[PDB]
Structure formats: structure tokens, C-alpha cells
Design a protein around this ligand. Structure first.
Ligand SMILES: *CC(=O)NCCNC(=O)CCNC(=O)[C@H](O)C(C)(C)COP(*)(=O)O
Lengths: 820, 71
């Protein structure tokens, strides 16, 4: 190849009866024709290839008022939609192209909307009707600093545009480019003019190279291709849909009539472009004709091809024209042809060129060495195709393209909750469809994580195979600083962490380190595998305080390690009773050894106390229970202040009963009266354990359940603090208040049960992380992500060898916008 | 008649006002004749006798030769 080959890494289109590349391959492969009569809602030659509707547009997605959208060319709107779709199909996140050198090259030659506007004025009409903005608008919404221009060579515009894009890439003027065109036949005056020119088929079909050839039928649509240099594309690991080897543009020059094409100019063009690509006639597997079905044009094009690519070739060169399917899109004819070729290169198949039955007597197919593709055959030998587009002013262009060289989460986002609904439904239908079944659920989750922008309305679905994930999407279709509250005694349940261990190796690794250290400590000083006690449903060993505190600590530390690997790094921490021990450890204050020693000593020294202790949850203000228990300090006290009207009374099982009966009040299933005078016997012993541990400055902001406020290191790193924490009331409500004060806007319950989360909701975005634990924790991280947190979903798929695969584009929230 | 009537028709298609303004010696393409404008001559010529007459004779005069020649 002479110059840098340009890679096509993505594309998008709107074509009659084809809303996208999928639908387009459907129409072309079925050999179906999109040409119909002029729909009733249009105005009036009586045939054409028409889109479903042109008045719909999601003005909110792109930040467009209805005012501005109404005065906006539907061509400008459509190109916006096509740009976002083309980038998403390329796999690129548009946010990333902001302030880059992205180039925009659009071919357009018809201004029907502006004609409508003028045959019947506010400040938007200037921008809404001016052609230059078809490309320029894109550059402004993406924030591209590369060249932005609209080119008018007549019917050959769109193809020329790609040429100009290619050159602009080869020079380094642009690093990525979007290239294509648009043409919308919404005005009867343009139809009348092209009809009075006599070029229009009375039968409304383009009989390309067929003896019936009597003109073209009009079409409308639009199309884009994302272009990178082959070097840059391969380096960046992008999905290559094709490679342009060479492109060229010339003019007919001294034609017979201004509008008569020239055979010699066409031959010069073909020779130049194929020599530059270095492709012989035998290497060409197919040529996308201009193929308008004109009595004059078809013989000239056929003769040029037979002169350049017919001679020096054994088998007949297959040819065809998409204008037989959807019609003559004029300004946007070129791009359409290219997209067709591209889909044939990736599919490695050919599709029929319709409206062919007998060769034009002016076209000796046999001598010229060319055959019209009429059968959806496969494509044999890599594969190389060529595209032509000619303008009525004589500007001709040709392009040479070659073919290319356990539990899973799926994330969807959208700019509107109803948009989120539709995004989920679209993804589900596609996952069920064959095209989506050619991609694995792993690859799909990966690409959703890496190749899609994460809008402000997000959601995550979990599943083991395709069907689970699909039904999850179906069901779906129907901030501040981060704060962690670590659950305390009473949130434990049989089966803690058994299922977290089997799905996520990070939880398993952290849980094994903590459980090995804790196994050692509790084996030396027993109240020999904590793993076994926690994982066994047939085990009430967790309700005794000699196991519940180490169990909670292990569950929560491994859970914090796994949330941190998923990116979720808390900024303010707090804990209810034993919960603090986790929070202070993950804050970096205590090493794993000292923390395990602390928690096992606390649990063991509290386990050896006699019975007769009790705790009751009571719907009463702190003031009320202070009124009720005062004078009984030696026997009963406030165990915890969990809310403005929710406190736990702790004390002698005798004195606890009349408190419950007075307020009758839920009795708590605890082995001892924690945070009460009954905890005095183990205080001083505990005071020696803490005296032999190393406390460091926390790496995060810690809020004390004893103080009820932000505790400093000098206080947090003293023996007196922790003995008072083991003795006095847990001021959890005051702690929630203090965390809100420092700037927390998102609260997470690290641990089983949803107790602390209910308490935090009472005090006030509140999420209870966890409590099948693969599901129970993918849920935690999903609720975090949708709350506003930036979860590195990419790092989740590092275990599987996932690859990037094409995915359905954004489901636009379309509403009507028009004039009157 | 076979001359001045051509001076009065080639302008009717060309658009010149004076019938004598036709440079009846210069080529049709040089006079500015389109596909439709060339064949409009043929389609209005047999309007009051009998394809590619005007590309066969690229000159108004040298086409006007074909009136009284063969009768
Ligand atoms: C914009 C456009 O029409 N583009 C390509 C499709 N058109 C053609 O191929 C036009 C080829 N020529 C003709 O159709 C005839 O030359 C005219 C233009 C109808 C006039 O005939 P006269 O020039 O012999």
C-alpha cells in the first residue's frame, strides 16, 4: 500500500427499512426492497426509499431545547444520533474524545428543511438551517478540535467526504475521524426539480445494469464510519470493521454534456486508486457500483470497470448496487455503498443486487468481464471490495476497502429512568437474539463495563448464564463523601460468609488470612476453625459472644477488602460496639495480628462472664430511658442510643424485664448485658490486652461509637478509650449525625443483616451492603455504583479472557419536533 | 423557408430574442445545447416528416441542410 491504511472501527446508519447495521444486513441478505410509495404524512416522483419518520429526536440527550430542535434541520439531528451510535459501535466512550483532535467530515447537498422554513423568524433558524452545522454541531457536542466541514460534490459527496477524512488522518491533522453523509427528502420542491430534470424512473426502481434502466428512484438516509489509522487502531485494540487501502477523487473534465459522465475520467480514476492500493483486477472480489439505472450512466460505468478491472481477470467480477434496495440517496449515496461493502467484508458474504433479470444490451457483461450479483452467496478468495460514487457535476470518487487482518454482572446506564428501562429492554432482546448469542456473557459484561459511558441513571444485573441475565433485564424494565457503618452484635446469622467464599477469590483470600490468624489466636486462648462455625447453618455457636465478635470481624474485614478491590474505598468509618474494631483496623490503626488479638480477647473475656445479663431494644428516647434507669446504675444502664426514639437497655436480666414490660420493646438474643455494669469484671483484664498492642494513625476519618463524634488519634490510641468503649453506651445515632456533619452523603452497612441501615435511615442515601452471597454482594456493589460511586468493573473481569464485542447503542428518548 | 425558420426556432429553444442572433455556423455544443435542448429541436421539428439528427449535424445551418434535400 502506498499510504497509511485507514481502519474502519465502527459505523452507524439510518436507511429505509434499516434502523441500523443489523437491520441493514437483514434487508440486504433477504434481497428485500425498501422502496415504497410516498407515505401519507409526506408531501408531493411518487415512489422513494423513505425512513419510518424524520420528526423524532431525543433533544434532552444532547442538551437541546424543544425550541432549538424545532428549528433544527432533521439532517443535523440525525447526524448527531449517528455520531453517538457510530462511536458506541466503535467501542469508544464519547467522554474520552472531549478536547481531542477528532475530525468530522459530512457530505450533504440538499436543504429541504430550510426551504420549508423560508416558504412561510427567531434566532435559532440561523443555526438550525445552516448546512455547515451538520458537521460543526457534532464537533461542538463531542468537544472535538479536529477539522469540521461539510462537502458538496453532488451525489458523490459522502464518498468524497470519506476520502477527505482519510487524507486528514494520514497527515496527522486528525487522530480519529467520523465520515459519512446525510440526505432527507422532506420537501416536494426538490422532488419536482429533480423530476423536471428527467432523471427519475417512472417505475420507481433503479434497474442497475438491467435493460429496463430508465432512471433512479429517490432515497433518503444517512451514515457514518469511524476511522483510525491502521497503526493506531491495531495499537489501541479496536474492533476493525475494515481497512481502506486507497481512495481518490477526480472530475469528468470535458464531457459531452455537463451532466454526461466520462468513460476516460472514470478509467483514470480506477487506474489511479487501484495502483495506489496496489490491487490487481483479480484481487477485487466485488465492486459497489454507483449504479443509478440511468440509460446514459450505466453503460459508461460498466465500460470503465471492464476496461480497468475486467481485462486481466479470469472469473467475472461481481457487482451490485444498494440503490436497487433503498434507492438513490444522492448526497448520502456514497457512504451507503461503503457500509454495504463493509458488512459484506465482515460477514464474508455477498447479497443480491435487486431489479436485475436481463443485461442491458448496451452492456456486454461477457466481454467486459463483469457479472451482477443476484444470489446471497458466500465470498471466496483476504477479501477486497471497491466503491464508486459519481456526481452530476462530474466529480467522481472511488474507495478500495479490504477485510480485517462464575457470576457475571451486566451494567446499563441512561440519562433518564424511562431511558434506563428502554436501555435494559433493548440489551435483553439483543442478548436473546442470534447476533447476541454469537457473543458470550463474559464478553458482554466486559464490553458493557469498558465500552459504554456510565450515565447518571445506572443499574447492574447479575446472572450465571445468558437466560438469568436476560430475565434480570426484563425485570428491570418493569453525592458526597462515602461512609461505612460496620454492623455489631445482633446482625450475625448462621451461614456468614460461606457463599462469599465460593464466588470471589478476593473475599476467600482475605477471609483465609483473617481466619488463619484468628484460628491461631482462638486456638491458644479458646472460649478449631472459625470458618467451620460461621459457614455451618446447623450452628448456633455464633450467638455466643466468644464467637460472634471474631465472626463479625472476619466477615467485615474480608468484605471491606473485596469492596476496596472493586474500587469502593470508604472515607469516613464508624462501628457499633465490636464493629469499631473492624473500622479501626481497616483504617490502618491496628495490624491484622493486633486486631485479631483485640477482638478475640474482647469476645473471650466477655464470654467467661456469668449469665443474668440481658439487652432489650426499646422504642424510647435516650431522655426517657435516662429517666427510667437513673438510680439503678449498679444494676442497669443504656446499652445503646441507636436513634432519636430507639435505644437498647442493657443490664441484669431481672432489671431488663421490667424495663421491657414498662415500655410494653423487643428482647435481644444476646448472651450477656453488653455495655453495662455487668461488663466491669472483664474491664481491667481487657485493659492489659489493649496495653500490649500497637495503635497507629488512621488512614481514614474515624467516628467513635463511645464519644459519638470524630475521635482523634491521641484519644483513639489510648487504653482508656477502648475500655470505656467496652463499658459505656454506643452512641450510634450521634455517630451518624457526626458523619453527616463532616460531609458524608452515602452510608454503607458493612456486615450481615440490615439493622444499622434501618438505624441510619431513622437518623436521616442509605445502603445495607450484604447479608446466595455471590448475589448478596454483587448487589452491594451494584447499589454502591448506582448511588454514584465509581466502581472499577473492568478489574472484575481480569480473571476471564474477555474481549470487546459490538453492542446495541443508546435507546434515544425520541419526541416530535417540527414547524408550523 | 428552410433557413429563416431555423433562425426562428433554434432561438426558441436557446432563448435568444432576435432571430438573427443565432450564430448558425458554430457548433451546437458551442452554441450551448443541452440533451433536452438538442432533442427539443427534434421533438418540435416534426410538429408540422421524421433520431440523433442534431448530434449527426453539430451546426444549425448544417442541420438545416436537411429540409428540401430529399423530396
Ligand atoms: C446527482 C445525480 O443524478 N447523480 C448520479 C445519477 N445520475 C446520472 O447518472 C446522470 C447520468 N446522465 C443522465 O441521466 C442524462 O445525462 C441526463 C442528465 C438526464 C440528461 O441527458 P443528456 O445529458 O444526454
Amino acid at each position: 500500500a502506498s499510504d497509511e491504511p485507514i481502519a474502519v472501527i465502527g459505523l452507524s446508519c439510518r436507511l429505509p427499512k434499516a434502523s441500523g447495521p443489523q437491520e441493514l444486513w437483514q434487508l440486504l441478505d433477504d434481497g428485500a426492497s425498501a422502496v415504497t410509495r410516498v407515505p401519507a404524512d409526506r408531501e408531493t416522483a411518487r415512489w422513494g426509499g423513505f425512513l419510518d419518520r424524520v420528526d423524532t429526536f431525543d433533544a434532552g440527550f444532547f442538551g437541546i431545547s424543544p425550541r432549538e430542535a424545532a428549528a433544527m434541520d432533521p439532517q443535523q439531528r440525525l447526524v448527531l444520533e449517528l455520531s453517538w451510535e457510530a462511536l458506541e459501535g466503535a467501542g469508544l466512550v464519547p467522554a474520552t474524545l472531549r478536547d481531542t483532535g477528532l475530525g468530522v467530515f459530512v457530505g450533504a447537498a440538499r436543504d429541504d428543511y430550510a426551504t420549508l422554513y423560508r416558504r412561510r423568524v427567531d434566532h435559532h433558524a440561523m443555526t438550525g438551517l445552516h448546512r455547515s452545522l451538520i458537521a460543526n454541531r457534532i464537533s461542538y457536542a463531542l468537544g472535538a478540535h479536529g477539522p469540521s466541514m461539510v462537502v458538496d460534490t453532488g451525489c458523490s459527496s459522502s464518498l468524497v467526504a470519506v476520502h477527505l477524512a482519510c487524507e486528514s488522518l494520514r497527515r496527522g491533522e486528525s487522530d480519529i475521524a467520523l465520515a459519512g453523509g446525510v440526505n432527507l427528502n422532506i420537501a416536494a420542491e426538490s422532488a419536482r426539480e429533480t423530476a423536471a430534470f428527467g432523471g427519475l424512473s417512472p417505475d420507481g426502481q433503479c434497474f442497475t445494469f438491467d435493460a429496463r434502466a430508465n432512471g433512479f428512484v429517490r432515497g433518503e438516509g444517512g451514515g457514518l464510519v469511524v476511522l483510525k489509522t491502521l497503526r493506531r487502531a491495531l495499537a489501541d485494540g479496536d474492533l476493525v470493521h475494515g481497512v481502506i487501502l486507497a481512495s481518490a477523487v477526480n472530475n469528468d473534465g470535458p464531457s459531452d454534456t455537463l451532466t454526461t459522465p466520462s468513460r476516460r475520467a472514470q478509467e483514470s480514476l480506477l487506474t489511479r486508486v487501484y495502483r495506489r492500493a496496489g490491487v490487481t483486477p483479480t484481487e477485487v472480489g466485488y465492486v459497489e457500483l454507483h449504479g443509478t439505472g440511468t440509460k446514459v450512466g450505466d453503460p459508461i460505468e460498466a465500460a470503465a470497470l471492464g476496461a480497468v478491472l475486467g481485462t486481466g481477470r479470469d472469473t467475472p467480477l461481481p457487482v451490485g448496487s444498494i440503490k436497487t434496495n433503498i434507492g438513490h440517496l444522492e448526497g448520502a449515496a456514497g457512504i451507503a455503498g461503503l457500509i454495504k461493502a463493509l458488512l459484506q467484508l465482515r460477514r464474508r458474504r455477498l447479497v443480491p443486487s435487486l431489479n436485475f433479470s436481463t443485461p442491458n444490451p448496451d452492456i456486454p457483461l461477457d466481454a467486459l468481464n463483469l457479472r451482477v450479483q443476484q444470489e446471497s452467496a458466500p465470498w471466496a478468495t483476504t477479501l477486497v471490495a471497491g466503491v464508486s460514487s459519481f456526481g452530476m457535476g462530474g466529480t467522481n470518487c472511488h474507495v478500495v476497502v479490504s477485510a480485517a487482518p462464575a457470576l457475571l454482572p451486566w451494567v446499563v446506564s441512561a440519562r433518564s429512568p424511562q431511558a434506563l428501562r428502554d436501555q435494559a429492554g433493548r440489551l435483553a432482546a439483543w442478548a436473546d437474539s442470534p447476533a447476541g448469542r454469537e457473543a458470550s456473557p463474559v464478553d458482554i459484561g466486559w464490553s458493557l463495563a469498558t465500552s459504554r459511558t456510565h450515565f447518571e441513571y445506572r443499574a447492574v444485573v447479575s446472572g450465571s448464564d445468558r437466560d438469568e441475565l436476560v430475565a434480570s433485564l426484563r425485570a428491570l424494565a418493569s453525592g458526597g463523601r462515602l461512609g461505612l457503618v460496620f454492623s455489631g452484635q445482633g446482625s450475625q446469622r448462621a451461614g456468614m460468609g460461606r457463599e462469599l467464599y465460593v464466588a470471589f477469590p478476593v473475599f476467600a483470600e482475605a477471609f483465609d488470612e483473617v481466619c488463619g490468624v484468628l484460628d491461631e489466636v482462638m486456638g491458644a486462648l479458646p472460649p478449631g476453625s472459625l470458618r467451620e462455625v460461621m459457614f455451618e447453618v446447623s450452628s448456633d455457636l455464633l450467638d455466643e459472644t466468644g464467637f460472634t465478635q471474631p465472626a463479625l470481624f472476619a466477615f467485615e474485614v474480608a468484605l471491606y477488602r473485596l469492596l476496596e478491590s472493586w474500587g469502593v474505598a470508604g472515607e469516613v468509618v464508624a462501628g457499633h460496639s465490636v464493629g469499631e474494631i473492624a473500622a479501626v483496623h481497616v483504617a490502618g490503626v491496628l495490624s491484622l495480628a493486633d486486631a485479631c488479638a483485640l477482638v478475640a480477647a474482647r469476645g473471650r473475656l466477655m464470654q467467661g462472664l456469668p449469665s443474668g445479663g440481658a439487652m432489650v431494644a426499646v422504642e424510647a428516647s435516650e431522655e426517657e430511658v435516662t429517666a427510667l434507669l437513673a438510680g439503678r446504675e449498679g444494676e442497669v444502664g443504656i446499652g445503646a442510643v441507636n436513634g432519636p426514639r430507639s435505644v437498647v437497655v442493657s443490664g441484669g436480666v431481672a432489671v431488663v424485664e421490667e424495663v421491657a414490660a414498662h415500655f410494653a420493646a423487643r428482647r435481644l438474643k444476646v448472651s450477656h448485658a453488653f455495655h453495662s455494669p455487668l461488663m466491669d469484671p472483664m474491664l481491667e483484664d481487657f485493659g492489659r490486652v489493649v496495653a500490649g498492642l500497637s495503635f497507629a494513625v488512621p488512614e481514614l476519618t474515624v467516628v467513635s461509637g463511645l464519644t459519638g463524634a470524630v475521635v482523634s488519634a491521641d484519644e483513639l490510641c489510648s487504653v482508656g478509650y477502648w475500655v470505656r468503649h467496652a463499658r459505656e453506651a454506643v452512641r450510634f445515632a450521634d455517630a451518624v449525625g457526626a458523619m453527616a456533619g463532616v460531609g458524608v452523603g452515602r452510608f454503607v452497612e458493612v456486615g450481615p443483616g440490615g439493622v444499622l441501615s434501618a438505624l441510619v435511615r431513622e437518623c436521616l442515601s442509605v445502603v445495607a451492603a450484604v447479608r446466595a452471597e455471590p448475589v448478596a454482594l454483587l448487589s452491594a456493589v451494584g447499589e454502591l455504583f448506582a448511588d454514584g460511586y465509581p466502581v472499577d468493573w473492568t478489574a472484575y473481569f481480569a480473571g476471564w479472557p474477555a474481549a470487546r464485542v459490538e453492542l446495541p447503542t443508546y435507546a434515544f428518548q425520541r419526541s416530535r419536533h417540527w414547524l408550523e | 423557408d428552410p433557413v429563416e425558420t431555423v433562425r426562428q426556432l433554434t432561438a426558441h429553444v436557446l432563448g435568444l430574442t432576435a432571430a438573427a442572433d443565432v450564430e448558425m455556423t458554430r457548433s451546437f455544443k458551442d452554441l450551448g445545447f443541452d440533451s433536452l435542448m438538442s432533442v427539443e429541436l427534434r421533438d418540435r421539428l416534426c410538429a408540422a416528416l421524421s433520431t440523433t439528427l442534431l448530434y449527426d449535424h453539430p451546426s444549425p445551418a448544417e442541420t438545416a441542410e436537411f429540409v428540401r434535400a430529399r423530396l
